[PDB]
Amino acid sequence: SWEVGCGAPVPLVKCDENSPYRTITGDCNNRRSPALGAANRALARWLPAEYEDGLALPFGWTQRKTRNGFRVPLAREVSNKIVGYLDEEGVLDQNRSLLFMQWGQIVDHDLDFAPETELGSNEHSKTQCEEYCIQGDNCFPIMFPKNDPKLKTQGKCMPFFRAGFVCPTPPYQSLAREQINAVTSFLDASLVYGSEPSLASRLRNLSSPLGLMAVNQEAWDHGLAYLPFNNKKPSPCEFINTTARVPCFLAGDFRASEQILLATAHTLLLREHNRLARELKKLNPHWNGEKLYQEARKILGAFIQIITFRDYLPIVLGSEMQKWIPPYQGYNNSVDPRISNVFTFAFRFGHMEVPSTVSRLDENYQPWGPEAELPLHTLFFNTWRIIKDGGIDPLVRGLLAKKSKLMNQDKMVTSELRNKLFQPTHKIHGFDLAAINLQRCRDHGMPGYNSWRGFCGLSQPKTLKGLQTVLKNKILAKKLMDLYKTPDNIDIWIGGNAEPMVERGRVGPLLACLLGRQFQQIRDGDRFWWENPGVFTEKQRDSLQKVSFSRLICDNTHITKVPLHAFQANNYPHDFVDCSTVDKLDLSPWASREN
Numbered sequence: 001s002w003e004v005g006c007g008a009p010v011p012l013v014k015c016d017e018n019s020p021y022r023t024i025t026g027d028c029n030n031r032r033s034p035a036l037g038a039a040n041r042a043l044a045r046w047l048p049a050e051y052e053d054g055l056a057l058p059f060g061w062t063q064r065k066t067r068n069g070f071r072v073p074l075a076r077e078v079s080n081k082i083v084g085y086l087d088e089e090g091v092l093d094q095n096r097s098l099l100f101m102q103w104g105q106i107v108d109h110d111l112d113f114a115p116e117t118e119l120g121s122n123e124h125s126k127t128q129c130e131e132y133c134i135q136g137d138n139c140f141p142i143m144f145p146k147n148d149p150k151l152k153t154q155g156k157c158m159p160f161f162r163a164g165f166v167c168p169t170p171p172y173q174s175l176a177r178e179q180i181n182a183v184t185s186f187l188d189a190s191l192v193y194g195s196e197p198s199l200a201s202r203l204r205n206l207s208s209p210l211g212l213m214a215v216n217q218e219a220w221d222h223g224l225a226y227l228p229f230n231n232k233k234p235s236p237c238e239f240i241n242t243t244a245r246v247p248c249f250l251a252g253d254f255r256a257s258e259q260i261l262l263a264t265a266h267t268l269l270l271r272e273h274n275r276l277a278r279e280l281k282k283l284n285p286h287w288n289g290e291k292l293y294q295e296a297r298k299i300l301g302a303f304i305q306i307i308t309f310r311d312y313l314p315i316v317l318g319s320e321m322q323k324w325i326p327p328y329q330g331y332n333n334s335v336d337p338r339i340s341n342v343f344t345f346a347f348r349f350g351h352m353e354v355p356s357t358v359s360r361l362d363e364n365y366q367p368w369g370p371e372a373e374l375p376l377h378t379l380f381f382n383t384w385r386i387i388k389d390g391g392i393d394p395l396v397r398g399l400l401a402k403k404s405k406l407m408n409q410d411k412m413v414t415s416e417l418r419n420k421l422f423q424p425t426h427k428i429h430g431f432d433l434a435a436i437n438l439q440r441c442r443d444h445g446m447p448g449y450n451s452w453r454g455f456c457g458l459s460q461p462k463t464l465k466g467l468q469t470v471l472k473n474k475i476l477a478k479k480l481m482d483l484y485k486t487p488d489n490i491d492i493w494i495g496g497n498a499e500p501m502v503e504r505g506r507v508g509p510l511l512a513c514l515l516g517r518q519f520q521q522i523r524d525g526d527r528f529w530w531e532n533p534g535v536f537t538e539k540q541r542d543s544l545q546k547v548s549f550s551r552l553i554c555d556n557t558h559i560t561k562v563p564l565h566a567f568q569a570n571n572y573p574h575d576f577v578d579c580s581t582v583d584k585l586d587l588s589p590w591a592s593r594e595n
C-alpha cells in the first residue's frame with residue numbers, strides 16, 4: 001500500500017538539538033522523522049489522490065473519461081451558473097469585520113502555498129497556453145461555455161497551468177502525483193520571516209546589530225515603517241499603473257501584495273517585529289542581533305498563534321470548534337504537521353468573504369478623500385495607493401470599520417474576483433477565482449464531495465432530493481445536479497462551500513470537519529508551541545494572552561481609537577475606545593538579568 005521515501009527536492013542538511021527558535025524552514029520541529037512539516041515537501045494525503053489515469057491526469061482532462069459514468073462540467077460553467085451574482089446589495093456580514101477576511105488569508109499564507117509549475121521560462125510554455133488555448137502537459141486551460149460573454153470579449157479560454165508536484169518537476173509516471181507546499185505547515189510567521197534560508201536574511205537588517213527586519217528606505221509612513229521593496233521585474237504592482245511605477249512589497253511570503261489590504265496587514269506585522277527588537281535591546285542591552293531577532297520572531301509567532309486560535313478559529317468554526325480542537329494538552333509527537341492537500345482547498349472558503357470594494361477612513365471614520373471607496377479589482381497588486389495616497393492608517397480603519405462579504409448560496413463570489421481578477425502575468429483584469437479554484441481541485445486530483453463527507457462521517461447523497469436536503473436548498477441542488485449528474489462528481493471546493501453555515505460559525509459541517517482537523521493537528525504536533533511547557537517561561541506566558549489585534553494596531557500605527565474585538569462587526573464612535581484602555585504586551589518577563 002506503499003511509497004516509502006521519495007524525498008528528492010530537498011538538500012539533506014540535518015538537525016540542531018536546541019537551536020532555541022524554529023528553523024526558518026520548519027525542519028527539526030519533529031525529532032523522530034525531521035521533515036514532517038518542512039516547506040517544499042509534499043502536502044499530505046488524507047485520501048488516495050483521485051485522477052483520470054489513477055496517476056496524474058486531472059478529471060476533465062480527456063474528453064471521453066467520465067468520472068463515474070458522467071462527464072464533468074467546465075469550471076467556468078460551474079462558475080457562471082452557480083457562483084456569481086449581480087447585486088452587491090444586502091451582501092455584507094452584519095457581524096464580521098473586513099479584518100475577519102483579512103486574517104484568514106493571512107493565516108492561510110502562513111501555512112500553505114502550492115506554487116505553479118515553472119518548468120521553463122524561456123519557452124512557448126506560456127504563449128501556447130493563453131494565446132492559442134491549447135491543452136498540454138502543464139497547460140490545463142479553463143475553457144468557456146458557450147453563452148459565456150467572455151467568448152465575445154476575451155477569447156476561447158482563461159490560462160491555468162498545473163501546480164508544482166514533487167520528486168522532480170520533470171514529468172512522472174508510476175504511483176501518485178503530489179503537489180508541494182512551499183511554506184512551513186506550522187503557524188510560525190513564515191509569512192513575515194521566510195520559509196527558505198535564502199529569503200529569511202534578505203528580509204533581514206544584517207547591516208546593523210539591533211535585530212530588526214530591513215525596512216523601506218525609499219519611503220515612509222508617518223514615523224512608521226514600510227515593508228522593503230521587491231527586486232524582480234516584471235513587477236505587477238508596476239503594471240497596473242505604469243505611470244506611478246511603485247513596485248510590489250517584499251515579505252517572508254510571496255503573495256503579500258495580491259491586494260492592498262493584505263499588503264497592509266503584512267505591514268503591521270513587520271513594524272511589530274521591529275518594535276519588539278528595540279524594547280529588547282533596551283531591556284537586554286547585551287543580547288546580540290540574532291537574539292533580538294529570534295526572540296522577536298519567537299514572540300511574533302506566538303502572537304499569531306493566539307489571535308488565530310484564541311480569536312479567529314472560534315468564530316470560523318463556531319459550534320464545531322471544541323469537537324476538533326478541544327483545549328491544549330501539550331505536544332503529542334505522533335501527530336502529523338503536514339498541511340493536507342484538501343485543506344488548501346477547504347481554506348478558500350474565504351473567497352466567499354471578500355466584498356466588492358475597499359475604503360479609506362479618517363480620524364472620525366468617514367470618507368478619507370474624494371475617491372475613498374474603490375472597486376476591489378483596482379486594488380490587486382496596487383501598492384501605490386499606499387505610499388502615494390495616505391499610508392496604511394486609512395486602510396486599517398477600513399479593516400476595522402467595514403464588513404466582510406457573507407457567503408450566500410445565491411451570491412457566492414463577487415465579480416471583482418469572479419470576472420475581474422488580475423493574475424501576475426496576464427495583463428487584463430479579466431480572470432475568475434471560482435473557475436480557478438475548481439480547475440485546481442482537479443489538478444490536485446481531489447476526491448469528490450461524498451468521499452470527503454464519508455471521511456468526515458457525514459451522510460452522502462446520491463439523488464437530487466438527497467442533495468437538496470443536505471444543502472437545505474432546492475435550486476442550488478438542482479443546478480449542482482444538472483452540471484454534475486451525481487453528487488459524487490462535485491468538486492470539493494464549491495461542494496463544501498454550498499453547505500449552510502453551522503451555528504455561530506462561518507462554514508458548514510464538511511468544512512468545519514476538514515478545517516478543524518488540520519488546525520488541531522498543526523497545533524498538537526508543533527514542538528515550538530507557545531503553551532508547550534518549557535517553550536516559554538511562565539510569566540512570559542501570562543504576558544502573552546494579553547496580546548490582541550487591537551493592541552497590535554496601536555503599537556504600530558497612528559490609529560489611537562480601537563475596538564476591543566477586532567474581528568466582530570464594529571461601528572465608529574461606539575465600539576471604539578482609546579488605545580490606553582488597552583492591554584499591552586509587557587516585556588519585563590523576558591528581561592535577562594545576567595548581571
Ligand code: HEM
Pocket residue numbers: 100101102103104105106108109111112113114115258259344345347348350351354417433436437440
Ligand atoms: C482580496 C483577497 C484575495 C484574493 C484576490 C485571492 C486570490 C487567490 C488566487 C488566484 C489563488 C490561487 C489558487 C489557485 O489558483 O488554485 C488563491 C489561493 C488561496 N487563497 Fe485566495 N485570495 C484572497 C483572499 C484570501 C483570503 C482573505 C484567504 C483566507 C481567509 C485566502 C486563502 C487562500 C488559500 C488558503 C489559497 C490556496 C493557497 C495554497 O496554495 O496553499 N485567500 N487566492
Ligand SMILES: *[C@H]1O[C@H](CO)[C@@H](O[C@@H]2O[C@H](CO)[C@@H](O[C@H]3O[C@H](CO)[C@@H](O)[C@H](O)[C@@H]3O)[C@H](O)[C@H]2NC(C)=O)[C@H](O)[C@H]1NC(C)=O
Pocket residue numbers: 240241243244384388
Ligand atoms: C496611478 O497613480 C497615479 C500617480 O499617483 C495616479 O495619478 C495621481 O492620482 C490622481 C489622478 O487622478 C491625482 O490626484 C489628485 O491630487 C489632488 C488631490 O488628490 C487633486 O487636487 C488633483 O487634481 C488630482 O485629482 C494625482 O495628482 C495624480 N498624480 C499624477 C502624477 O498623475 C493615476 O490616476 C493612476 N493611474 C491609473 C491608471 O490608475
Ligand SMILES: *[C@H]1O[C@H](CO)[C@@H](O[C@@H]2O[C@H](CO)[C@@H](O[C@H]3O[C@H](CO)[C@@H](O)[C@H](O)[C@@H]3O)[C@H](O)[C@H]2NC(C)=O)[C@H](O)[C@H]1NC(C)=O
Pocket residue numbers: 095565567568569
Ligand atoms: C455575532 O458576533 C459576535 C462575535 O463577533 C457574537 O459574540 C460572541 O458570542 C459569544 C456567546 O454570546 C460570547 O462569548 C464569549 O464571552 C463569554 C462571556 O462569559 C466568555 O466566557 C467566553 O470566553 C466567550 O469567548 C462573546 O461575547 C462573543 N465571543 C467573543 C470572543 O467575542 C455575538 O453573539 C453577535 N454579535 C452581535 C453584534 O450581535
Ligand SMILES: *[C@@H]1O[C@H](CO)[C@@H](O[C@@H]2O[C@H](CO)[C@@H](O)[C@H](O)[C@H]2NC(C)=O)[C@H](O)[C@H]1NC(C)=O
Pocket residue numbers: 205207208210212213214215216217
Ligand atoms: C538597519 O537599522 C539601522 C538603524 O535604524 C538603519 O539605519 C538608520 O537609518 C535611519 C534612516 O534611514 C536613521 O535612523 C539612521 O540613519 C540610522 N539609525 C541608526 C539608529 O543607526 C539601517 O539602514 C537599517 N537598514 C534597513 C534596510 O532597515
Ligand SMILES: *[C@@H]1O[C@H](CO)[C@@H](O[C@@H]2O[C@H](CO)[C@@H](O)[C@H](O)[C@H]2NC(C)=O)[C@H](O)[C@H]1NC(C)=O
Pocket residue numbers: 332333334335336
Ligand atoms: C497522538 O496522535 C495519534 C495520531 O493522531 C493518536 O492515535 C490514536 O491512538 C489510538 C489508541 O488506541 C490508536 O488506536 C489510533 O491510531 C488513534 N486513535 C485516535 C482516536 O486518536 C493518539 O491518540 C495521540 N496520542 C496522544 C498522547 O495524544
Ligand SMILES: [Ca+2]
Pocket residue numbers: 110111112183184185186187188189190191
Ligand atoms: Ca508557516
